[PDB]
Design a protein around this motif. Sequence first.
Motif, PDB file in Angstrom:
ATOM      1  N   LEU A  26       0.828  -1.200   0.000  1.00 43.40           N
ATOM      2  CA  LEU A  26       0.000   0.000   0.000  1.00 43.40           C
ATOM      3  C   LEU A  26       0.872   1.265   0.000  1.00 43.40           C
ATOM      4  N   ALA A  27       1.925   1.264   0.809  1.00 41.29           N
ATOM      5  CA  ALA A  27       2.807   2.417   0.901  1.00 41.29           C
ATOM      6  C   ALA A  27       3.375   2.773  -0.464  1.00 41.29           C
ATOM      7  N   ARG A  28       3.890   1.777  -1.177  1.00 44.39           N
ATOM      8  CA  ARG A  28       4.448   2.025  -2.505  1.00 44.39           C
ATOM      9  C   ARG A  28       3.367   2.468  -3.496  1.00 44.39           C
TER      10      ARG A  28
ATOM     11  N   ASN B 116       1.501   9.543   7.304  1.00 50.86           N
ATOM     12  CA  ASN B 116       0.230   9.972   7.877  1.00 50.86           C
ATOM     13  C   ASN B 116      -0.931   9.298   7.151  1.00 50.86           C
ATOM     14  N   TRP B 117      -0.832   9.208   5.831  1.00 53.36           N
ATOM     15  CA  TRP B 117      -1.866   8.542   5.042  1.00 53.36           C
ATOM     16  C   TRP B 117      -1.922   7.062   5.423  1.00 53.36           C
ATOM     17  N   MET B 118      -0.753   6.464   5.650  1.00 57.53           N
ATOM     18  CA  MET B 118      -0.668   5.056   6.029  1.00 57.53           C
ATOM     19  C   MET B 118      -1.289   4.860   7.416  1.00 57.53           C
ATOM     20  N   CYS B 119      -0.956   5.746   8.352  1.00 57.53           N
ATOM     21  CA  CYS B 119      -1.517   5.677   9.696  1.00 57.53           C
ATOM     22  C   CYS B 119      -3.046   5.761   9.608  1.00 57.53           C
ATOM     23  N   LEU B 120      -3.547   6.648   8.747  1.00 54.49           N
ATOM     24  CA  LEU B 120      -4.986   6.812   8.546  1.00 54.49           C
ATOM     25  C   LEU B 120      -5.652   5.539   7.977  1.00 54.49           C
ATOM     26  N   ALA B 121      -5.101   4.977   6.902  1.00 52.64           N
ATOM     27  CA  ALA B 121      -5.658   3.758   6.278  1.00 52.64           C
ATOM     28  C   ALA B 121      -5.656   2.598   7.266  1.00 52.64           C
TER      29      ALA B 121
ATOM     30  N   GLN C 143      -9.848  21.794   6.959  1.00 54.59           N
ATOM     31  CA  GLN C 143      -9.444  20.858   8.007  1.00 54.59           C
ATOM     32  C   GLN C 143      -8.293  19.954   7.603  1.00 54.59           C
ATOM     33  N   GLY C 144      -8.184  19.703   6.303  1.00 56.03           N
ATOM     34  CA  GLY C 144      -7.149  18.823   5.798  1.00 56.03           C
ATOM     35  C   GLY C 144      -7.337  17.409   6.323  1.00 56.03           C
ATOM     36  N   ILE C 145      -6.235  16.789   6.730  1.00 55.03           N
ATOM     37  CA  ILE C 145      -6.206  15.418   7.258  1.00 55.03           C
ATOM     38  C   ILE C 145      -7.054  15.283   8.540  1.00 55.03           C
ATOM     39  N   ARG C 146      -7.278  16.413   9.212  1.00 56.72           N
ATOM     40  CA  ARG C 146      -8.061  16.458  10.439  1.00 56.72           C
ATOM     41  C   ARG C 146      -9.538  16.133  10.201  1.00 56.72           C
TER      42      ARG C 146
ATOM     43  N   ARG D 157      -6.862  12.132  14.317  1.00 55.22           N
ATOM     44  CA  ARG D 157      -6.573  12.912  15.515  1.00 55.22           C
ATOM     45  C   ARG D 157      -6.264  11.988  16.692  1.00 55.22           C
ATOM     46  N   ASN D 158      -7.101  10.968  16.853  1.00 47.85           N
ATOM     47  CA  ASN D 158      -6.983  10.005  17.947  1.00 47.85           C
ATOM     48  C   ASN D 158      -5.742   9.144  17.912  1.00 47.85           C
ATOM     49  N   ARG D 159      -5.481   8.547  16.750  1.00 45.04           N
ATOM     50  CA  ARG D 159      -4.369   7.610  16.595  1.00 45.04           C
ATOM     51  C   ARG D 159      -3.110   8.026  15.856  1.00 45.04           C
ATOM     52  N   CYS D 160      -3.118   9.179  15.194  1.00 47.53           N
ATOM     53  CA  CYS D 160      -1.954   9.575  14.403  1.00 47.53           C
ATOM     54  C   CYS D 160      -1.326  10.911  14.745  1.00 47.53           C
ATOM     55  N   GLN D 161      -2.161  11.897  15.026  1.00 46.22           N
ATOM     56  CA  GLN D 161      -1.686  13.231  15.341  1.00 46.22           C
ATOM     57  C   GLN D 161      -0.682  13.241  16.502  1.00 46.22           C
ATOM     58  N   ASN D 162       0.423  13.960  16.317  1.00 50.19           N
ATOM     59  CA  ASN D 162       1.471  14.086  17.335  1.00 50.19           C
ATOM     60  C   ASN D 162       2.073  12.765  17.801  1.00 50.19           C
ATOM     61  N   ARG D 163       2.064  11.761  16.936  1.00 50.29           N
ATOM     62  CA  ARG D 163       2.642  10.472  17.277  1.00 50.29           C
ATOM     63  C   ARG D 163       3.765  10.174  16.301  1.00 50.29           C
ATOM     64  N   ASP D 164       4.596   9.202  16.659  1.00 46.80           N
ATOM     65  CA  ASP D 164       5.701   8.772  15.808  1.00 46.80           C
ATOM     66  C   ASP D 164       5.040   7.809  14.808  1.00 46.80           C
TER      67      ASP D 164
END
Length: 130
Positions: free
Chosen positions: A8-10, A27-32, A104-107, A113-120
């Motif tokens: 998926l990443a590629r 970020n897109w990967m974290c979202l999917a 809002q963008g990705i927000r 917001r819950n699982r990706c924002q401000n995370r590694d």
Amino acid sequence: KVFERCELARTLKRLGMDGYRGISLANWMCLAKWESGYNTRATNYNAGDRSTDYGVFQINSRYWCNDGKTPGAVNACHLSCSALLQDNIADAVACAKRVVRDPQGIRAWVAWRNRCQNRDVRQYVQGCGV
Ligand code: NA
């Protein structure tokens, strides 16, 4: 189709998602990952407002795609919601790009917001060669 992480990443990179409107590929990967577990046929009915979330990015029928049964809905992506359930994710990506062109963008996705924002989020793309 249930994508493998790096597959998926590629794919997302080839589709021009890396840095789209300032949003990094990780970020897109974290979202999917959190929205569907990388599953393109994922659907979720929200009994509360009669709308349904479709596909890999779980795009909502109230504003983005048309499924005919959602009350007072619009179709900003100008696609049948069924297009968001294909194994080929080209249309889902084009629609995800449309979503983030709003302020809002990705927000726009609460899960981000819950699982990706401000995370590694580096973990989602590591070793994928992207
Ligand atoms: Na819609």
